[PDB]
Amino acid sequence: MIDVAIAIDAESVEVTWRNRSGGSYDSRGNATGASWADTQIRAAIQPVSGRELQDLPEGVRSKVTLVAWTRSEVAENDQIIYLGDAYRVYAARPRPMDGFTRIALGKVSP
Amino acid sequence: MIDVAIAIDAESVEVTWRNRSGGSYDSRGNATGASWADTQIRAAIQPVSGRELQDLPEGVRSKVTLVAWTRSEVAENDQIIYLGDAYRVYAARPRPMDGFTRIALGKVSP
Amino acid sequence: NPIPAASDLKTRYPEFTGVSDAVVNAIIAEVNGMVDDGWEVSDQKPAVLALAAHMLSREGYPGRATNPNSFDPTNRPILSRKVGDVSTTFGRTDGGAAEGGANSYNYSSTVYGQTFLRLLRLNAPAVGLV
Amino acid sequence: NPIPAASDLKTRYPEFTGVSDAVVNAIIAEVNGMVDDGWEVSDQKPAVLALAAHMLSREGYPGRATNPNSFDPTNRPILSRKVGDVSTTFGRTDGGAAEGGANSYNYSSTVYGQTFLRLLRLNAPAVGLV
Amino acid sequence: NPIPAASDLKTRYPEFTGVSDAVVNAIIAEVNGMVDDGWEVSDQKPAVLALAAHMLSREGYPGRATNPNSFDPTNRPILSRKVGDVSTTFGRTDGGAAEGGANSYNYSSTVYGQTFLRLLRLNAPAVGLV
Amino acid sequence: NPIPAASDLKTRYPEFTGVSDAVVNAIIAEVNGMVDDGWEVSDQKPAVLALAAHMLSREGYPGRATNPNSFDPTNRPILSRKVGDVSTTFGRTDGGAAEGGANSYNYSSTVYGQTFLRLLRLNAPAVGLV
Amino acid sequence: NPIPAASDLKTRYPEFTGVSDAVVNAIIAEVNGMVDDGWEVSDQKPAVLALAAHMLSREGYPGRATNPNSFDPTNRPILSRKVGDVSTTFGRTDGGAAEGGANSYNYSSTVYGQTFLRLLRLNAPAVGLV
């Protein structure tokens, strides 16, 4: 009798998964990114080295990273909207023997 | 029955939190930093690699760092006045499942 | 017990609001036998209302499971867990788990069972003659 | 017990202020039977007032849960935890958890039941003839 | 027991919907002997319905396994596991695992056998004269 | 006990200065019954003054909690803690925690209860005839 | 037992479909002696059908092993394992492993043995006169 992902249910939160399908290129060489599909989903987010300040000459900006451990299937280039801001997926470590993955998220807004 | 931050209450101290709101730029290009708000608050400060001496050609000066573990909400660019000197926040690791954060502080006075 | 209490535990025990056919017809019929008119009026309704919920929560949720389909026919307790790198540990329940029975029915598992037990001891002293 | 004490524990026990219908009608009626006129005047109101809160807090909160919906029908105690990398460990509660009962009702779990127990021992010596 | 209850546990116990021939003919015939007309009407159908599911779930799933073929002829409990680097630990079940029997049939393993046991104790007092 | 000692424990026990209505009217009324004129003059005031404080400190504070609203209806002890990466571990209190009671009222929890106990044993020898 | 049940357990116990000469002739002949006409008609076929499978599963698989040739003449249980860096731990079985026999034959190892045991206790009461 197997249930490991039952641990991810103790702490979770509603983040909007945003699955992506690629586009193509205009005859002039430009790029067209399209085909987003949204779905509310549950994750277990933890702040592994989040919100590092950067006082560049151009001003001040932060560097935010996170980890996910979600039950659904998420690829390497998708989006997850959490706490009102979008995060792009660095890298996933899927475990198909069970149902869950592990994801690195970086904040998109500069 | 959940209480984890009850550990931060064993050791604590009154530091003055100094919350910040940004400004804008003068038409000549300069900068105007304003909108501070002060509040006495309790923290649990520990000296993780504090007070490193630096004997530069210009003279002698120290390099002070600290960690906080406070219960209140502190952003990445605020101030905390402790032991008579100001400290600026490097990076926070908020844990919204509980109520507390973890902060890196660096002394401001050169 | 003139009236099998039906569709009322959803008002008494708000957490159960998923299904009603498995409750009234399938389970309440299995409880209304234990109650006897030798009890008191203040107990015949609450006691069966409690025991039905104990039987329900014995399984996953009112019918066999909650909305997720993660149900265990053996009520294995969860002793610990960790989610920074997913891990769990469970208990061992073969005949009797821990300070528990192996030849009777354990009414002291959940709170509903304890409420049924506390009423049962009150209204039904045990003594016979034959 | 001429008057079933109702809507007053919210003044006596200030932590309970969420709901009132599940308190006065759904639980107090289940407690005001244990109290008898053979008790003393100083106990009849406080004893029932305490036992009602014991029954309430035995479940999650006045009705079945607090504002967040995280209630456990088996009261599993939390022994330890850690929040640098989230982890928890619970106890085992199958019939009797630890120095607890498995065939009676354990009145000595929360403070409220302990108050009720200390009054019950004072006012109700147990001795019979039949 | 005039009617061997057949093909109805799938309605009574919704988790069993995979196979029917191994249920009605191969197992129900093995359980409808334990039931006797000396029981009450409210128990004869539910008791056998529960014991059949107990026998089914004692093995992997209705016939010998679930859709994946990972069945253990010795029911070894899983105490813990970890998926950052796959690891599991099992229990030991040689004659009796933990608070379990080794010379009788342990009816108190799953919920279904516990229901059957609690009915059997109610309906069948054991006393003889020969 | 001609005079229920009221609003005086704030002078006797300085730590309690938060609320006075919950003390004099709600709690002192619950203690002044245990004291009897068969005691000694030097004990009737201090003993009740101590027992009221024991009852107060049994809850979070004077009224149900201190200024922060972090109160536990179960007096779970804190065995260890760590603040370099926040962690705590608690005790297990179900019927009796450790060298503690499960069917009586434990007067030996805090110091105030021990003071009440030491006066009670002195002034009230236990012997009857009926 | 007029008819030694042969080549039928492959239909009763689907997991065994490898070899049939080692089953019918080599093993079933070793079981059909224990069954007696003093049993009941509903048991003489299922009981031997179960005991033959218990004897088969006592060894690796119907004949001495499964398709891989990894068989252990001592039924050493596997307590834990790890595959991020291969490791296993086994149990100790010398005279009796854990809650197991050392001078009798343990029928409570697998489920098939428990089924044989539960039928045996039912049909064969033990009493003699000589």
Quickly describe the structure:
Chain A is an all-beta fold. Chain A has strands at residues 13-25, 31-43, 52-56, 59-63, 65-67, 79-82, 85-92, 103-107.
Descriptive labels:
part of a larger assembly; 7 chains; A: 110 residues; mainly beta; two-stranded antiparallel sheet; 51% strand; flat; C: 130 residues; two-stranded antiparallel ribbon; 4 helices
Your description of this structure?
- The structure is cut from a larger assembly and holds two copies of chain A (110 residues) and five copies of chain C (130 residues).
- Chain A is mainly beta and 110 residues long.
- Chain A contains no helices and eight strands.
- In chain A, the strands form two sheets. Chain A has a six-stranded antiparallel beta sheet, with no helix packed on it.
- In chain A, strand 6 (79-82) and strand 7 form a beta hairpin.
- Chain A is flat, with a radius of gyration of 16 Å.
- Chain C has four helices and two strands; from the N terminus they run αααββα.
- In chain C, helix 3 (41-58) packs antiparallel against helix 4 (111-123).
- Chain C is globular, with a radius of gyration of 17 Å.
- In chain C, a hairpin with a 4-residue loop joins strand 1 (78-82) and strand 2.
- Helix content of chain C is 30%, strand content 7%.
- Chains in contact: A-B, A-C, A-D, A-E, B-D, B-F, C-D, C-E, D-F, E-G.
- Chain C binds chain E through residues 26, 29-30, 33, 58-59, 63-65, 71, 73-76, 85-98, 100-106, and chain E through 12-15, 40, 42, 46, 57, 77-84, 91, 93, 96-101, 106-112, 114, 117-118, 121.
